A paper describes a structure:
BRCC36 is the catalytic subunit responsible for the majority of K63-Ub specific DUB activity in the cytoplasm and in the nucleus as part of two distinct macromolecular assemblies characterized by the presence of either of the MPN− pseudo DUB proteins KIAA0157 or Abraxas. The Abraxas complex (ARISC) functions in DNA repair and breast cancer suppression, while the BRCC36 isopeptidase complex (BRISC) promotes interferon dependent responses by deubiquitinating and stabilizing the type I interferon receptor, IFNAR1. BRCC36 consists of a functional metalloprotease JAMM/MPN+ domain followed by a predicted coiled coil region implicated in protein-protein interactions. KIAA0157 and Abraxas are required for the catalytic function of BRCC36 in both complexes, and enable association of two additional shared subunits (BRCC45 and MERIT40) to each holoenzyme.
Optimization of the CfKIAA0157 construct boundaries by deletion of poorly conserved C-terminal residues 290 to 471 (CfKIAA0157ΔC) yielded crystals in complex with full length CfBRCC36 (residues 1-253) that diffracted to 2.55 Å resolution. Following manual rebuilding and refinement, two highly interdigitated CfBRCC36–KIAA0157ΔC heterodimers were apparent in the asymmetric unit, arranged in the suspected super dimer configuration. The structure of each protomer of CfBRCC36 and CfKIAA0157 consisted of a canonical MPN domain (residues 1–165 in BRCC36 comprising an eight strand β-sheet flanked by three α-helices and residues 1–180 in KIAA0157 comprising a seven strand β-sheet flanked by three α-helices), followed by two non-canonical helices α4 and α5 within the predicted coiled coil regions. The MPN domains of each associated in a pseudo two-fold manner centered on helices α1, resulting in a unified β-sheet and “fused” MPN+–MPN− superstructure (buried SA = 2902 Å2). Non-canonical helices α4 and α5 of CfBRCC36 interacted with helices α4 and α5 of CfKIAA0157 in the form of a coiled coil helical bundle (CCHB). The helical bundle was tethered against the fused MPN domains of BRCC36 and KIAA0157 via a mixture of hydrophobic and hydrophilic interactions.
Numbering used by the authors:
A (entry chain D): 5 to 42, 54 to 75, 77 to 184, 188 to 215, 221 to 264
B (entry chain A): 4 to 54, 64 to 99, 120 to 249
Write the structure that this text describes.
Amino acid sequence: DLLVTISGAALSLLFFENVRSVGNQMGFLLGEALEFIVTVKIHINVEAIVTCPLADLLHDTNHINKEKLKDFVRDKSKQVIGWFCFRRNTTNLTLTLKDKLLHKQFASHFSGVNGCKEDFFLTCLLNASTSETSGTHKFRHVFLRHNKRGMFEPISLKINNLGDDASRSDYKPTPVRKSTRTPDSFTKLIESLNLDGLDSAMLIQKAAEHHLMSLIPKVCESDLEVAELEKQVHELKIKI
Amino acid sequence: SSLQKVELQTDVYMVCLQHALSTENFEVMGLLIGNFACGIAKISAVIILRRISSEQLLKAAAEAERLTVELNRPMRVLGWYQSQPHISFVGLIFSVFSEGKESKEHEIFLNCFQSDNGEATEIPLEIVHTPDISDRCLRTMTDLSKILVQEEEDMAEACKDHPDVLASIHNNAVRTRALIHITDIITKPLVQTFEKRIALNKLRATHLQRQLQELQK
């Protein structure tokens, strides 16, 4: 049994990046996979997303240049558990043959490194249509994986919120297996606190606030850094 | 040798009722222990079950033997009881937590029956007077607290040693509240009940002593 989980923050960032782009957009899903004993349950959590021009991954051919794909993702390959495809001006949530091809290629390439089976490599199909008077904006999406029987079956998505998350007894069971081999940014913060119940929960939240507040200028820096580099590359392309 | 009537002791009746009122969410269960004489099944003790199931019957049959030698009387598992909130063997069903929306009146039903091979019919029940609360019955309803605590400690055991700090804090928070919830609802009122029972007995005892003293004159 399979379940895809994602936070409001991560999901908002995905939709934020999609409505930004001039036209259609694709990229990769970063996250982990957890196993729970009950049969066994599989939770594939989506931590972050990253955009990528498909042309930068193609030879010349519609085949993914495996050399160019490694150079872009680099050391973040062990986190890629899926890819997404965004299309404007369509209410049609449809897998194209081209999309099926990209899924199979991306599955084979990442399955060895990400610590996950090729079975549950994710594909997220998003779209954005607008009304005649553009007074109503509709946003649709779905998660897919390639079945062992050759099927692209939809997976249940759970957006973890304050009312209901995927860890619902009120206890949080210890996962038997995790495909993550990357240090968590938040757990590193708690380790820095050098802790030795309620009082501990207060400090973590307070420390997270100061940490979160210090990240804000760093986020803005990296944003304008890429934004300028996005312009220079584009300016050169038009130049020629 | 044919079951004709069921006699339930009042102090055992109290234990079953107390167990039924422990929660209005789930159906609780237990095993009726006693003797079967001339068509009369007399229940003088009871065993609280942790929640048909087996193996527990073996622990009950062994306890029944421990009850035989102590009480100097034939003791065997005569059957079981179960609660029903918001709606060959002897069965008791304590229907509880049923109140009127406007009348503010609460109802409690107690049905007695004989069960065998999934079949059952009504059986005449009489609640027989007891001059006190049995030592075994006192210990029985104290075990309810111990069993509830034991259930919670088992659940937290499976989630113990969680790598994520936030999860460990969450689990210890859940265990803390749940233990407190048991103490406040089950353990503490039972403590108060016993204490008040003793004090109010001596109040009646001193009252009867004054009555007994002047009646002779």
